[PDB]
Amino acid sequence: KIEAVIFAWAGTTVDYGCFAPLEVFMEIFHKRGVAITAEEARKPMGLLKIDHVRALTEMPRIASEWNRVFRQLPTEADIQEMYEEFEEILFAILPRYASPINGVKEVIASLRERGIKIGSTTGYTREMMDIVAKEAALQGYKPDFLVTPDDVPAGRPYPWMCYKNAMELGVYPMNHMIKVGDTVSDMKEGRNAGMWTVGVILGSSELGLTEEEVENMDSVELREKIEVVRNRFVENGAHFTIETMQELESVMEHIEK
Amino acid sequence: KIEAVIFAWAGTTVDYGCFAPLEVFMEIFHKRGVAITAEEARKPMGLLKIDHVRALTEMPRIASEWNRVFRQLPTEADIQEMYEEFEEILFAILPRYASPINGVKEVIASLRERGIKIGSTTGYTREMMDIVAKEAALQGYKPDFLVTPDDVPAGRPYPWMCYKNAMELGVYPMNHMIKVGDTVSDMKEGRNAGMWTVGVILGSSELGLTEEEVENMDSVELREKIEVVRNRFVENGAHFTIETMQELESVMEHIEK
Ligand SMILES: [Mg+2]
Ligand SMILES: [Mg+2]
């Protein structure tokens, strides 16, 4: 019996394609002369934002570039400084990226009718979430609970946030819960937490497409990209893979057999 | 691979037989004119002390007698009042009941050598533990971390305290941990948290015997009582059972196969 579902935020319940942090990540590196790609920027998507900045400076390609510019490798000074700008730019546009993804709200309402608790974990800090959650609520979305990396010792891939969701929701064991996310770090979080782990494709950070791009893309090109994402989720721990949230119910019935 | 081991306190690491509260639970009920057996007083051993008093008032036999004497069932005020007396008494004698059980420390140090983190959960309040922990530490025992029901939404059998341990000790998943306890509620906490659950027999609250009573007892009767406890532990979800702590290391090695 699945008594609760723990949802990721960006790229899962709000912000189709997880675009809010994409250009911000590229913007902060572009200034130093180190231009990164959208694919690199998306690699550590899901982790706490500051950990994300560090992970980017850790990447060989980005590190080689940077060192070859400033004549040295990125120091904690360079990370703190970039994350600093990351916040200033993120906070201004943040209200525009809290729109509930197409059919998520009906799924949420369906889960509540059955008495299933609604939890959530995030990559955003508490300060950022006060903005995202308020705005999402205005648009018709509010989970039963929400935990950010600021509430526990560390964010994803650690299972700390999921354990806190269970605690405040009163649901145990962990296998009576489902984690649904859209990034590789979301899958690692669900598994390290010992819960049933589900990956969503359309609207995910891993796909990195806007709704329009999905609606207007050549069917064959789309399916190729969909399977690339499905395989990535699977290789990284996913018990299940769904194209949209509309299949969540089916994964639940399957698990309960 | 087992990364950490969570031990219960009274009855597992310290206070052989778990006598510290025994006579107190009996005292607070006899005063009201409702005599309770030692078996009844020990049945819910492990739960937060206040929850323990409430559990006793919920037991059919105890509830029935109270209804006979007072013409009503126990009131929250009654429980609140009994618990106040439970503290006044328990506090004055706590220090005497905080001494490590014979060979536990040996197993403890042998685990620290194998790079194993030691965590702990209790039924005692934060206030009570200050006393127990200070004294236990004076006699050679001090785990890496300790959690009480005061740190989480509820105590045993809920797995909250164990998740906290996992967070602070930085270990995951839960099955990379072993829960070592001596009560039924200790077994349910281990299973509810999704970890390897092990019951200690000699010196456990379930046995109820002291060291002298154990040694100065017939060899047929003892093995009879040990089997009663062993079956109880197992019947309640325990994966494995050990008579003394010197068998823990074997269970570990066994599991890592
Ligand atoms: Mg996400
Ligand atoms: Mg105990």
- A53: domain CATH number? 1.10.150.240
Please report the residues numbered 140 through 159 in chain A whose beta carbons come closer than 8 angstroms to any beta carbon of chain B.
152-153, 158-159
CA distance A203 to chain B (A): 29
Distance CA B22, CA B13 (A): 17
The verdict on a CB contact (< 8 Å) between A167 and B160 is yes
Q: Which residues of B touch A168 (CB under 8 A)?
A: 153
Tell me how many residue pairs between chain A and chain B have CB atoms under 8 A apart.
Answer: 43
Residues from chain B contacting residue A152 (CB–CB below 8 Å): 167
Question: What whole-number distance in Å separates Cα of residue A87 and Cα of residue A125?
Answer: 10
> Are A173 and A208 within one domain?
yes
- Tell me: do B91 and B109 sit in the same domain: no
To one decimal place, what's the resolution in Å?
2.3
B60 interfacial to chain A (CB closer than 8 Å):
no
* DSSP string for chain A: ---EEEE-SBTTTBSTT--TTHHHHHHHHHTTT-PPPHHHHHTTBTB-HHHHHHHHHHSHHHHHHHHHHHSS---HHHHHHHHHHHHHHHHHHGGGG-PBPTTHHHHHHHHHHTT-EEEEB-SS-HHHHHHHHHHHHHTT---S--B-GGGSS--TTSSHHHHHHHHHHT--SGGGEEEEESSHHHHHHHHHTTSEEEEE-TT-TTT---HHHHHHS-HHHHHHHHHHHHHHHHHTT-SEEESSGGGHHHHHHHHT-
B68 C-beta neighbours (distance < 10 Å), count: 10
* Axis-axis angle for helices B76-93, B22-30 (nearest 10): 140
Residue A126 Cα, gap to closest chain B Cα (Å): 19
Question: Which residues of A fall within a CB distance of 8 Å from B163?
Answer: 163-164, 166-167
Which of B152, B168, B194 shows the shortest C-beta gap to A167? Answer: B152
Give me the CATH number covering residue B161: 3.40.50.1000
User: What are the residues facing A197 on neighbouring strands?
Assistant: A179
- Measured in Å, residue A209 CA sits from the centre of ligand 1 at 14
The answer to whether residues B51 and B167 belong to one domain is no
The tally of domains found in chain A comes to: 2
Residue B240 is which amino acid? F
Statement to judge: residues A157 and A74 lie in one domain: no
- Of the residues B163, B175, B196, the best mutation for testing chain A's interface (the one with the most A CB atoms within 10 Å of its CB) is B163
Which structural domain, as residue segments, surrounds residue A220?
A: 1-19+98-256
Report CA(A183)–ligand 1 centroid distance (Å): 5
Q: A162, A195 in Cβ contact below 8 A?
A: yes
- Residues in chain A with CB shorter than 8 Å from the CB of B160 are 167
Largest separation between any pair of C-alpha atoms in chain A: 60
Residue A163 and residue B158: Cβ atoms within 8 Å? Answer: no
Query: Which of B32, B63, B97 marks a domain boundary?
Result: B97
Q: Determination technique for this PDB entry?
A: X-ray
In 3D, which of A160, A166, A165 has the Cα closest to residue B165? Answer: A160
**Contact yes or no for A220/A119 (Cβ under 8 A):** no
Q: Return the biggest CA–CA distance within chain B.
A: 59
Q: Are B34 and B15 in a shared domain?
A: no
Q: B36, B66, B97: which is the final residue of a domain?
A: B97
Of B137, B110, B102, B143, nearest to B15 by C-alpha is B102
CB A30 within 8 A of CB A116: no
Whether A128 and A44 share a structural domain: no
Same domain flag for A54 and A152: no
Determine the distance in angstroms separating the CA of A183 from the nearest CA of chain B, rounded to an integer: 20
Chosen for mutation from A172, A179, A189, A197 (greatest number of chain B CBs closer than 10 Å) is A172
Whether A84 and A120 map to the same domain: the answer is: no
Establish if A160 touches chain B: CB-CB under 8 angstroms. Answer: yes
Exposed/middle/buried for B115, CB within 10 Å: 0-12, 13-18, 19+? exposed
Residues with Cβ within 8 Å of B89's Cβ and at least 6 positions away in sequence, in order, are B24, B27, B28
Residue B19, token pair as written in the block = 């006598």
User: What are the tokens at A112?
Assistant: 């509540």
Q: How many angstroms does the Cα of residue B140 sit away from the middle of ligand 2?
A: 19
> Strand pairing of B4-8 and B177-181?
parallel
B194 interface with A at CB cutoff 8 Å: yes
Domain boundary residue among A58, A80, A97?
Answer: A97
B66/B114 same-domain check: no
In the DSSP assignment, the letter for residue B154 is -
Residue B201 exposed, middle or buried by CB count within 10 Å (0-12, 13-18, 19+): buried
A179 and A157 Cβ atoms separated by less than 8 Å: no
Contacts of A66 (CB under 8 A, 6+ apart): A32, A34, A57, A73, A74, A78
Residues B80 and B130 grouped into a single domain: no
Contact B155, B183 (CB under 8 A): no
Of B167, B168, B174, the CB nearest to A194: B174
- Token pair belonging to A182: 């859209």
Cα B138 from Cα B143, distance rounded (Å): 13
Cβ-Cβ contacts under 8 Å for A213 (sequence gap 6 or more): A17
For the beta carbon of residue B30, count every other beta carbon within 10 angstroms: 12
A244 and A184 inside one domain: yes
Distance, in Å, from the CA atom of A234 to the CA atom of A38, rounded to the nearest integer, reads: 22
Distance from CA of A26 to the nearest CA of B (A): 32
Q: Distance from A82 to chain B by nearest Cα, in Å?
A: 28
Same domain assignment for residues B66 and B4: no
